């Protein structure tokens, strides 16, 4: 009797991943109190309006 | 931010003078010597707004 034997495994696991979050934006103000164009021009992100 | 409040602008002509200004002019030699005007300047820089 004689045997034999010859056996490989070869597994290749690439992922990869990306993410790009870009936000701008640019109120401006013409007339009206100082206090009140400093407080209406700073951009709140939930209500841009 | 860039915040604006007021606009600011000197009249052109016929201005009336600080009275330190205006003595540390009058004293100042006839015979150009550098070292006083530097000390005007020094003391109250090169230019007005």
Redesign the interface.
């Given at each position: 009797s004689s045997h034999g034997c010859k056996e490989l495994e070869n597994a290749l696991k690439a992922a990869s991943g990306t993410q790009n979050n870009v936000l701008r934006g640019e109120p401006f103000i013409r007339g009206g109190g100082?206090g009140f164009?400093?407080g209406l021009?700073?951009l709140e992100l939930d209500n841009p309006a | 931010?860039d915040?604006?409040?007021a606009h600011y602008k000197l009249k052109p002509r016929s201005l009336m003078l600080h009275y330190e200004f205006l003595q540390r002019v009058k004293r100042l030699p006839l015979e150009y010597s550098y070292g006083e005007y530097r000390d005007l300047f020094r003391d109250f820089g090169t230019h007005y707004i």
């Amino acid at each position: 009797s004689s045997h034999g034997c010859k056996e490989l495994e070869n597994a290749l696991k690439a992922a990869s991943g990306t993410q790009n979050n870009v936000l701008r934006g640019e109120p401006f103000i013409r007339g009206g109190g100082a206090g009140f164009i400093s407080g209406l021009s700073y951009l709140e992100l939930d209500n841009p309006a | 931010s860039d915040l604006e409040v007021a606009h600011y602008k000197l009249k052109p002509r016929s201005l009336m003078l600080h009275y330190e200004f205006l003595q540390r002019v009058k004293r100042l030699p006839l015979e150009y010597s550098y070292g006083e005007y530097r000390d005007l300047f020094r003391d109250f820089g090169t230019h007005y707004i």
